UniProtKB/Swiss-Prot annotation, chain A:
Function: Cadherins are calcium-dependent cell adhesion proteins. They preferentially interact with themselves in a homophilic manner in connecting cells; cadherins may thus contribute to the sorting of heterogeneous cell types.
Covered range of the whole protein: 108 to 320 of 829
Name listed for the protein in its UniProt record: Cadherin-3
Keyword rRNA-binding on entry: no
Positions annotated as glycosylated: 94
C-alpha cells in the first residue's frame, strides 16, 4: 500500500539545521543493481538553484536553506533514478513541495485615520463606513493572514458610550444607537484595532472619525 | 520510483474547511486504526472507504498532540501512516517574573554577569523560531554616569555590565525595562523590569 501522491509540506523559516532531510526516494529496481538519484527543476538545477538537493546513493531529498512562502509558495521538482550504466527503468517522479505559512507579517491598516459620515436619524444597524487592514500572510489555509477587527474605545461618550460596533471580519463600522445629534456631538473618534491569526496574533491600531450629518 | 516512507506534515489550527483531505491511500475497501482514529482521541482522522482518501476531521493543536501514528488497511499488510503536526505561533512570550534582581560590587570589570532573566514561550523552539525568545533592553534609568551601561545576551538573557563607572554613593541602583520577543526577535514582545543593585 502506498500514497497516490505525497506532496511534502514544509513550513517556511525552519530552524533546520541545514541541510535538512525531507523524505527518501526509492527506485523500483531495488535489489538488482546500484542506483544513483538526482533531482531537477526550479529549486534544484534551475533558478533558484541548490535550494534542494538529493543524496546520490541514499537518496534522501534534502533542503539546503530555510524557505520563504511569500517568495515561492510551491516547488515542483523531478526525481531521477539511473543505474551505474546510465540506464533508467522508470519515469521521473513528480516531487511537490508545499511551503506552509508562518505568521511572519504583521497586520497593517491601509490608513492611520479612516473617515466616515452618517445621518443623525438613521436606523440602528446602519453601516457608517468600512476600515481595512492587510496582512501578507496566507489567509486561505491558515489564519495568519486573517484579521479580526475591534474597537478599543470611543470619544466623546455622548449621549453615551458604546454607540458604534465593528464587524469582526469585514471591518464595517455600524451605529447601534438612536440619539445622534450634531448640535450636542458633531463628531466621534474611535480607536480601532486589527489582530491577525483571527484575533490571537499581533495587533495594530488606527483611528476612525465619524462625522454626524444634517 | 516512490517514497520509502512519506509522513504528512499538517500545520496546527488549519482553516480547512473540515473534513479536509490529506493524501490518498492506494492498494476493495479502506479503513484506519490507531490513536486518532479508533482509539483515543477517537474520530480525529478518518478515511473514505472507497476512494482511500485520508481525512482530517478537525483542526489540530500541536501543543496537545504533536504527532500521530496510524495504520491504514485494505480488504497486503497494514501501512504505517505518520502525521506530524507542525507549529504555528499561537503563544506569546512571557517573563517568569515581573521583576528580576541581581547585584554587583562597584569594582567589577566590564563584561561582569549581573543576572540571568528568562521568558517562556509554549511554542516549538526545535523546528521553528516560534518558541525562540530574543532578549533586549528597552531602556535604563538613571543614565548616570551614562546610558547603555548594560547589555543582555540575545538568547541566554544574561545581563552584563559594560560600563567602568559604577559608584554606589552616586547611583545605588539601576532599573532596566527589558524585552523578550518570540520568532527570535521578529514576533511579539513582552516586557519586565530588572533592578541592578550596586553592592555596599
Ligand atoms: Ca516569509
Ligand atoms: Ca500575519
Ligand atoms: Ca508568512
Ligand atoms: Ca496550539
Ligand atoms: Ca501538552
Ligand atoms: Ca511564540
Ligand atoms: Ca504553537
Ligand atoms: Ca562600599
Amino acid at each position: 500500500m502506498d500514497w497516490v501522491v505525497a506532496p511534502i509540506s514544509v513550513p517556511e523559516n525552519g530552524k533546520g539545521p541545514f541541510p535538512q532531510r525531507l523524505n527518501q526516494l526509492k527506485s523500483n529496481k531495488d535489489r538488482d543493481t546500484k542506483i544513483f538519484y538526482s533531482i531537477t527543476g526550479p529549486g534544484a538545477d534551475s533558478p533558484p538553484e541548490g535550494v534542494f538537493a538529493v543524496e546520490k546513493e541514499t537518496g534522501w531529498l534534502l533542503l539546503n536553506k530555510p524557505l520563504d512562502r511569500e517568495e515561492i509558495a510551491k516547488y515542483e521538482l523531478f526525481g531521477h533514478a539511473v543505474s551505474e550504466n546510465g540506464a533508467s527503468v522508470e519515469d521521473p517522479m513528480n516531487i511537490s513541495i508545499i511551503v506552509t505559512d508562518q505568521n511572519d507579517h504583521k497586520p497593517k491598516f491601509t490608513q492611520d485615520t479612516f473617515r466616515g459620515s452618517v445621518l443623525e436619524g438613521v436606523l440602528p444597524g446602519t453601516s457608517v463606513m468600512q476600515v481595512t487592514a492587510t496582512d501578507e500572510d496566507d489567509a486561505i489555509y491558515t489564519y495568519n493572514g486573517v484579521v479580526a477587527y475591534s474597537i478599543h474605545s470611543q470619544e466623546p461618550k455622548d449621549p453615551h458610550d458604546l454607540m458604534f460596533t465593528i464587524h469582526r471580519s469585514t471591518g464595517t463600522i455600524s451605529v447601534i444607537s438612536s440619539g445622534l445629534d450634531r448640535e450636542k456631538v458633531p463628531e466621534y473618534t474611535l480607536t480601532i484595532q486589527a489582530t491577525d491569526m483571527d484575533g490571537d496574533g499581533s495587533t495594530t491600531t488606527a483611528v476612525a472619525v465619524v462625522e454626524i450629518l444634517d
